[PDB]
Amino acid sequence: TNHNLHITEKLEVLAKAYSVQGDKWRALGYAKAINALKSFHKPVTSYQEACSIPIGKRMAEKIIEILESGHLRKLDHISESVPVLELFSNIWGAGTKTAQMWYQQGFRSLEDIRSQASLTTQQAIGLKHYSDFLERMPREEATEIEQTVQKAAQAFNSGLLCVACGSYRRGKATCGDVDVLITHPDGRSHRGIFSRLLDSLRQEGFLTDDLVKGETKYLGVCRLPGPGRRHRRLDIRVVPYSEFACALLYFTGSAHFNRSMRALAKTKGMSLNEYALSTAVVRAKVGPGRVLPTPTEKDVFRLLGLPYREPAERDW
DNA sequence: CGGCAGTACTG
DNA sequence: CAGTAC
DNA sequence: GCCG
Ligand SMILES: [Ca+2]
Ligand code: NA
Ligand code: NA
Numbered sequence A: 001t002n003h004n005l006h007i008t009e010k011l012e013v014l015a016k017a018y019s020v021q022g023d024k025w026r027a028l029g030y031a032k033a034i035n036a037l038k039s040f041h042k043p044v045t046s047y048q049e050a051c052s053i054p055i056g057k058r059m060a061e062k063i064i065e066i067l068e069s070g071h072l073r074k075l076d077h078i079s080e081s082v083p084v085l086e087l088f089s090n091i092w093g094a095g096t097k098t099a100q101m102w103y104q105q106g107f108r109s110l111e112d113i114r115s116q117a118s119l120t121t122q123q124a125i126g127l128k129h130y131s132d133f134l135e136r137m138p139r140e141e142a143t144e145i146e147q148t149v150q151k152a153a154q155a156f157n158s159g160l161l162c163v164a165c166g167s168y169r170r171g172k173a174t175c176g177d178v179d180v181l182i183t184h185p186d187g188r189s190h191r192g193i194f195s196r197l198l199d200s201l202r203q204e205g206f207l208t209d210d211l212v213k214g215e216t217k218y219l220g221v222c223r224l225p226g227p228g229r230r231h232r233r234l235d236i237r238v239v240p241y242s243e244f245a246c247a248l249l250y251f252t253g254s255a256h257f258n259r260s261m262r263a264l265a266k267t268k269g270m271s272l273n274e275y276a277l278s279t280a281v282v283r284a285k286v287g288p289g290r291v292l293p294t295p296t297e298k299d300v301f302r303l304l305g306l307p308y309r310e311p312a313e314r315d316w
Numbered sequence B: 001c002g003g004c005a006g007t008a009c010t011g
Numbered sequence C: 001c002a003g004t005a006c
Numbered sequence D: 001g002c003c004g
Helices: A005-020 A024-037 A047-051 A057-068 A073-077 A081-089 A096-104 A110-115 A121-128 A130-134 A139-156 A196-202 A244-250 A255-267 A299-304
Strands: A161-167 A178-183 A206-213 A218-220 A232-238 A271-272 A275-279
Touching: A005 A024, A005 A057, A005 A073, A005 A081, A005 A096, A024 A057, A024 A255, A047 A057, A047 A073, A057 A073, A073 A275, A081 A096, A121 A130, A121 A206, A139 A161, A139 A178, A139 A196, A139 A232, A178 A244, A196 A206, A196 A218, A196 A232, A244 A255, A255 A271
Parallel strands: A178 A232
Antiparallel strands: A161 A178, A206 A218, A218 A232, A271 A275
């Protein structure tokens, strides 16, 4: 696996500092570089050998900094606000600009957020389940959640099928997220069961809190009935059968996977989002793009000129 | 240099 | 409009 | 942050 973890560690700390400080691109380059250093077959030996890794000049300059020295000195200049901002980012619905606001307001602890800090409804639901949301769950409990949502959905219409796309479907032992995709094979009967099932599950108590409540997209908190059960974040999306193959890809993950798939689709003049695979829109543009039917996940790998990758092989 | 995904919700 | 989310 |  990671043959250069002594450097990937210190760089993941640097990338975290950038991610916590609004520099999404600095963090994205760092993460793509750690994801490349962790997947490389042999450990690094020189600067030349480091830069040839698809790693730049200043990144391999840090690789060589940790290869010749034992501690990267960039880390010594990291701002002391980085931990506080990261802590505020650990709250749901709270990112770099809200952590920055809380920080300049003199807040330096979660208790300060729960006492004097102004919170939104979502930032409150995140602040109350702070520990649970950071404790990823075993695959078995995610399966319990999946089957529970599927059974309750099938009671409204037995034709409906469900799938727990996400790190679970990728085969990851832990999952601090549960995204259940529900659809109907005909693509027309699905319309109208979202609210009924959502109220059903909240009535029984499967759902504890609600975050983003849209017509087609549900985001909230669930908790399996039983002792010592921690609150897990669940999303329930009811998209038509036509778009199911384009949705199941994105909601399977990872993000970096759908980022490389989106780049590859863009080079071949195609837009690959979580709703449909369309080709290049007319060009300022003088027209939208043309949808390409892709019923199965292989059809999407096909129209993109790529071999089918198993969900297990989607960490990119 | 300049692009790195586009989207819906919430406020 | 922006912020945070997938 | 890297790379076309
Ligand atoms: Ca996830
Ligand atoms: Na966060
Ligand atoms: Na339980």
